[PDB]
Amino acid sequence: CTWEPDGKLTC
């Protein structure tokens, strides 16, 4: 999982 610049936590 990573943090997106838009703010969302993606996996």
Residues in the chain: 11
- For residue 5, what are the contacts with CB-CB under 8 A and spacing of at least 6? none
d(CA 8, CA 2) in angstroms, rounded, equals 9
d(CA 7, CA 5) in angstroms, rounded, equals 5
d(CA 8, CA 11) in angstroms, rounded, equals 10
Query: Max Cα separation, the chain?
Result: 15
Q: How far apart are the first and last CA of the chain?
A: 4
**Which amino acid appears at position 1 of this protein?**
C
- Is residue 8 within 8 A of residue 1, CB to CB? The reply is no
b/e map 1-11, b = 16+ CB within 10 Å: eeeeeeeeeee
d(CA 8, CA 10) in angstroms, rounded, equals 6
